[PDB]
Design a protein around this ligand. Structure first.
Ligand SMILES: *[C@@H]1O[C@H](CO)[C@@H](O[C@H]2O[C@H](CO)[C@@H](O[C@@H]3O[C@H](CO[C@H]4O[C@H](CO[C@H]5O[C@H](CO)[C@@H](O)[C@H](O)[C@@H]5O)[C@@H](O)[C@H](O[C@H]5O[C@H](CO)[C@@H](O)[C@H](O)[C@@H]5O)[C@@H]4O)[C@@H](O)[C@H](O[C@H]4O[C@H](CO)[C@@H](O)[C@H](O)[C@@H]4O)[C@@H]3O)[C@H](O)[C@H]2NC(C)=O)[C@H](O)[C@H]1NC(C)=O
Ligand SMILES: *[C@@H]1O[C@H](CO)[C@@H](O[C@@H]2O[C@H](CO)[C@@H](O[C@@H]3O[C@H](CO[C@H]4O[C@H](CO)[C@@H](O)[C@H](O)[C@@H]4O)[C@@H](O)[C@H](O[C@H]4O[C@H](CO)[C@@H](O)[C@H](O)[C@@H]4O)[C@@H]3O)[C@H](O)[C@H]2NC(C)=O)[C@H](O)[C@H]1NC(C)=O
Ligand SMILES: *[C@@H]1O[C@H](CO)[C@@H](O)[C@H](O)[C@H]1NC(C)=O
Ligand SMILES: OC[C@H]1NC[C@@H](O)[C@@H](O)[C@@H]1O
Ligand SMILES: [Ca+2]
Length: 510
């Protein structure tokens, strides 16, 4: 029953939310096991890490809840008042530009959007907060000549600070996963500066590295901000690389700027050419890594983070349309669609073949060359290294499952989603038999049974994992009218004509 699994997912969310609100209200970091909490800034001022990241999930559930609508409404109010009255981003502390942009700036923007379209709360509260934070973060683009920002910035002074390690290089995905957020902010404010600054990073990236010709659109994970040149590093769709590809497509879906689709196409073909492979014995499609350039060997290691590719590929091929209607359009990519189904299956298998039914942080697919103390999956398609056995309540697989279900309408995806939701329920719960004290937490080990719990609840458990599971069981969700930022914060597809009138156009080319 769709509405039933809906009640269940809403219940799981509320159990986590009730516990968080009771013990760690207003804190950035929260541990459900010991009910402990703290803020990230050295000064102990809150960033709204969990509250801001969760507001839009509260709004989505409020909009369709039949059993807890009233509770969700009250929590939105609680969150909104706190965001307006307590949260203050004028903090003398250095924060990571990427994380703060995708979680806080993005969450405030989507809260504004849903508040607007769902007519709940005061959208102005979120927009005003977004403008102020956006201005603090935007200062990061004034540090180098290339326009590529250093990893962190002080929210009060505006002073930028380079990455501590990696020879001072910035992570490629970190400055190429800020575009949806700043462009939507430009759209809402009419302030072109946000748009101009965030689009600026691509030219040096592509030009200075001969990215298309030399790398076939595949990016090493580190880029020096002052030169715009890649640092000797791994090429992977996992951490520090993943969302660079994500936002190439999502910008096109959001603003209709074709250049980014063209760039996206180039990277996808490059990915199929250099990183794609199949495991044994199930022939599951997976995306590997190239630690030593494209000329080196292909590593079968894959971050759970890569699993978002199922949804991305499906979204890019259909542009949000049901396959039924998409299959007849000129822009439909049969290749991308088939691979989307393939990668989503593979990622589902990472749960299905797991002893706990939950996929670990990282897996190593079987390429017939796994010839020590590694754990083998049920079928043997992949292994799990002793140090990668943790599960941080990540959303990437349920993310892709949601897209596949709504675009294909194949009920098999809702079945998969249900199994994973149940595995999270049974294997990450604390006080599992008491709905009054029950809550959910991360795992230090999701391979051993019973699973070993870690005292921490990721904000994305609420912002993404439960959100995508919830949307999966919504009977109607038009993917042609929304584009999710990388933290599952939905933005509306922008009107081309309005963008034109605001002088928001592609300021570079290739
Ligand atoms: C948050 O929740 C809200 C709901 O609470 C949700 O908003 C929408 O949810 C549904 C999305 O699928 C949507 O229902 C679909 O509506 C289709 C369009 O036809 C119907 O809506 C028309 C437009 O409604 C707006 O304008 C109305 C004034 O014109 C206004 O009164 C209304 O409040 C909306 O603002 C409306 O004009 C149509 O009217 C015709 O039909 C009436 C009878 O229903 C008749 O009385 C009228 O004279 C006229 O002939 C019509 O009501 C509809 O095509 C679609 O049908 C499909 O869905 C069924 C589901 O059972 C399937 O069997 C099959 O697929 C079928 O084809 C479906 O009913 C709601 O109307 C929206 N609600 C509101 C109030 O906006 C929102 O999406 C959600 N947000 C999120 C992200 O969670
Ligand atoms: C569209 O959106 C953009 C992006 O956010 C906005 O641009 C920002 O605009 C503000 C204000 O115009 C800029 O901030 C101001 O910068 C001035 C110049 O900075 C130089 O001097 C400081 C020394 O203090 C150096 O640290 C810095 O490196 C530069 O050399 C400052 O002089 C201003 O300071 C004054 O205001 C602050 C406010 O708290 C006071 O504390 C100070 O004492 C002083 O009175 C101020 O900081 C900001 O740089 C712009 N950001 C970017 C990325 O461009 C647009 O304003 C907005 N609307 C428009 C016009 O399109
Ligand atoms: C909405 O919030 C804005 C900013 O806090 C405030 O100025 C406005 O009065 C609020 N609207 C109302 C009256 O609810
Ligand atoms: O796995 C989730 C966590 N890291 C990856 C990000 O893109 C976002 O999904 C969240 O911050
Ligand atoms: Ca993501």
């Amino acid at each position: 029953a769709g509405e039933m699994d809906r009640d269940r997912i809403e219940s799981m969310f509320l159990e986590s939310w009730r516990d968080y609100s009771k013990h760690g209200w207003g804190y950035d970091v929260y541990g459900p096991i010991e009910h402990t909490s703290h803020n990230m800034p050295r000064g102990n001022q809150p960033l709204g890490w969990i509250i801001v990241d969760s507001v839009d999930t509260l709004m989505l559930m409020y909009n369709s809840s039949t059993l807890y609508k009233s509770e969700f409404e009250a929590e939105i109010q609680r969150s909104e008042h706190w965001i307006n009255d307590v949260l203050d981003f004028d903090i003398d502390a250095e924060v990571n530009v990427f994380e703060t942009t995708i979680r806080m700036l993005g969450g405030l923007l989507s809260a504004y959007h849903l508040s607007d379209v769902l007519e709940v709360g005061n959208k102005t509260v979120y927009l005003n907060k977004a403008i102020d934070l956006g201005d603090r973060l935007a200062l990061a683009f004034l540090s180098t000549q290339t326009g590529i920002p250093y990893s962190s910035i002080n929210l009060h002074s505006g002073q930028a600070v380079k990455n501590h390690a990696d020879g001072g290089a910035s992570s490629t995905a970190e400055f190429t996963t800020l575009q949806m957020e700043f462009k939507y902010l430009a759209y809402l404010t009419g302030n072109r500066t946000y748009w101009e600054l965030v689009e600026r990073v691509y030219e040096p990236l592509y030009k200075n590295n001969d990215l298309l010709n030399t790398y076939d659109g595949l990016v090493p994970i580190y880029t020096f901000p002052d030169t715009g040149k890649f640092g000797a590093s791994t090429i992977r769709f996992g951490s520090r690389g993943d969302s660079f590809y994500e936002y190439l497509l999502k910008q096109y879906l959001l603003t209709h700027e074709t250049l980014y689709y063209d760039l996206y196409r180039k990277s996808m073909e490059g990915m199929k050419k250099h990183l794609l492979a199949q495991s044994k014995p199930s022939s599951l499609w997976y995306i590997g890594e190239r630690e030593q350039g494209l000329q080196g060997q292909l590593s079968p290691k894959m971050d759970h983070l890569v699993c978002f590719m199922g949804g991305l590929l499906a979204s890019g091929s259909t542009e949000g349309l049901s396959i039924h209607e998409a299959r007849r359009r000129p822009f439909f990519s049969k290749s991308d669609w088939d691979l989307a189904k393939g990668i989503t299956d593979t990622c589902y298998q990472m749960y299905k073949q797991s002893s706990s039914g939950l996929a670990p942080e990282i897996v190593v697919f079987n390429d017939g060359n796994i010839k020590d103390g590694w754990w083998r999956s049920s079928v043997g398609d992949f292994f799990v290294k002793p140090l990668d056995r943790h599960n941080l309540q990540r959303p990437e697989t349920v993310e892709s499952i949601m897209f596949m279900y709504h675009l294909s309408h194949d009920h098999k995806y809702r079945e998969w989603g249900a199994e994973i939701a149940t595995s999270f329920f049974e294997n990450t719960c604390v006080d599992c038999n008491d709905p009054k004290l029950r809550r959910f937490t991360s795992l230090s080990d999701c391979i051993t049974l019973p699973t070993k719990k870690s005292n921490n609840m990721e904000s994305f458990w609420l912002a993404e994992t439960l959100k995508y599971l919830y949307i999966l069981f919504l009977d109607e969700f038009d993917l042609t009218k929304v584009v999710f930022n990388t933290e599952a914060h939905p933005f509306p597809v922008l009107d081309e004509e309005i963008l034109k009138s605001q002088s928001l156009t592609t300021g570079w080319s290739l």
